[PDB]
Amino acid sequence: SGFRKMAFPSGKVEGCMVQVTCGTTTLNGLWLDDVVYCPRHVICTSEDMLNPNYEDLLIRKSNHNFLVQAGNVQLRVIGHSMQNCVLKLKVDTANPKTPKYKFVRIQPGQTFSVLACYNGSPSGVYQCAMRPNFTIKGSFLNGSCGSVGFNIDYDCVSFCYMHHMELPTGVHAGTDLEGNFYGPFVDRQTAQAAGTDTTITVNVLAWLYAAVINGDRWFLNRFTTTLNDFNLVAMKYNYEPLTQDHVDILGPLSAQTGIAVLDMCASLKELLQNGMNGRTILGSALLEDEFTPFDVVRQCSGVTFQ
Amino acid sequence: SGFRKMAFPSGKVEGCMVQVTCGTTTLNGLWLDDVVYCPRHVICTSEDMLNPNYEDLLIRKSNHNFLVQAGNVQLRVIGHSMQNCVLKLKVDTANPKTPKYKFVRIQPGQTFSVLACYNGSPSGVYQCAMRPNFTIKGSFLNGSCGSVGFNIDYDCVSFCYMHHMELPTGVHAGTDLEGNFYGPFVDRQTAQAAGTDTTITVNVLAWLYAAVINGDRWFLNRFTTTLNDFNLVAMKYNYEPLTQDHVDILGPLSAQTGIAVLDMCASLKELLQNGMNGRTILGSALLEDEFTPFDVVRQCSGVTFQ
Ligand SMILES: [Zn+2]
Ligand SMILES: [Zn+2]
């Protein structure tokens, strides 16, 4: 037993990571088949990022202005194109390490693993949730752009995130692999507001079920509630409203533990109104919302990948 | 910026993971050069684990009683031997995926990444500290035995942990790669006490420095203290005593932030005596002690591995 924030094994994504340089800007690219994907602001100087015209900046670039390096090996660039906020660099060599993969646009509340990279080289791996306000709370230093987020299902890597920006508030923003930003963000160094950062209610509930499965039971109360009455409390505490879809997804955890979803809702409501009184739940002193219901089942069942 | 619990990229260790079966017991092995390392209780039935005589049990086993499988490929076992609590299985094929590696026995308080495995297959990766009482708080289900813990420095993997046991208290115990248990534990299903689980004081201090580097500054007080007076408080709260070696290791973080180590000690003492009053530090509502001073510097500097 025990319960930990876990990232997916990252070996499949390590084999795809390259370094992309244009002029004096260097960041990370993702090399799948004969295409390298990277943030389009590889073509930007520090000054350009204040207010870039990406079309006009890219006009000045040719294939040979893009240096793509994998280890100590130069990939030859035979074509380039801008898709929303990503560049796609056609290279003359397919990555022999390409895994079975997909591109997916994930929903708010879903989670994924980030392989933090610098100069094309892997540095570490950690788990992230796409917040309801479409930011992520990550660990990204200068040169980490082009790092990707992904999920693994058996032998298939589902890429869902590419890192582009740190907001002046210290949280992080990026795109799917088609270059479309999550949230209302743009790849420009200007002040950008993410709205209210609400809590992923269905995720908090799955984590409470994981706690019960692992023996943390103290917070189990003897109240129940209703969806509408719980959501009254949830809105007060800036929690996402719980819907029957969310109840449905929690079904298996409800079944395994014998705790009706609305009973857990009443327990969470009490935690929201009373705090934790100096106690912890699965080693944490606040309510954790970056575990999905599938994350819980995955870890309480030991799913493997090949 | 931002600060996250980060595991090392796990691709090098994934390439070494195999499945080992003996009779009806299956667990994980580590395949480096022409040797497979796995916990010796692969030779045990459920009944045997109550009180095993490993020498007498192993006498009954021959090379062919050990099935070692890598993917869909059978490795031929040409020799076996027991080193403390690990078996070493000589195979007739060197792992072509073997990285540069070392075996190291880490010290209490140091950290490492665990690649949780089942049936020889990677399931996820997470960061762990060797607690002062020589347990780890992990996520290990049945069949996770033989999973390893490691650190990566450039192109060299330093294996430091192999998982063997869950204690009846729910924490975890295992060996170095020479088969020697961390702590006073034995590979037997009998009740085993780990002593008092104290807090890794130097680690908490490094994390407070990481907080300051990232803008979390509220806890900075205007007291200082002395090593002896701080340790008076530290013993009351079951904190490891702070030594000048620990002060020395914090030197660079002290230098970068301008906060003398004993000043941070006075801030921690106030947190210990007053709590956090409903606030958080780097997104946590308790004091985190599973980041080493090197973990902080690594993440605030962006060290890469190849
Ligand atoms: Zn960038
Ligand atoms: Zn076992």
Curated annotation (Swiss-Prot), chains A, B:
Q: Where is this cross-link: Glycyl lysine isopeptide (Lys-Gly) (interchain with G-Cter in ubiquitin)?
A: K5, K90
Q: How does it assemble?
A: 3CL-PRO exists as monomer and homodimer. Only the homodimer shows catalytic activity. Interacts with host FBXO22; this interaction promotes the proteasomal degradation of nsp5.
Active site: which residues?
A: H41, C145
* Record localization: Host cytoplasm; Host Golgi apparatus; Host nucleus
Q: Which residues form the Peptidase C30 domain?
A: 1-306
Catalytic activity, per the record? Answer: TSAVLQ-|-SGFRK-NH2 and SGVTFQ-|-GKFKK the two peptides corresponding to the two self-cleavage sites of the SARS 3C-like proteinase are the two most reactive peptide substrates. The enzyme exhibits a strong preference for substrates containing Gln at P1 position and Leu at P2 position
- The residues forming the signal peptide are none
Full-sequence range covered = 3264 to 3569 of 4405
What is this protein's record name? 3C-like proteinase nsp5
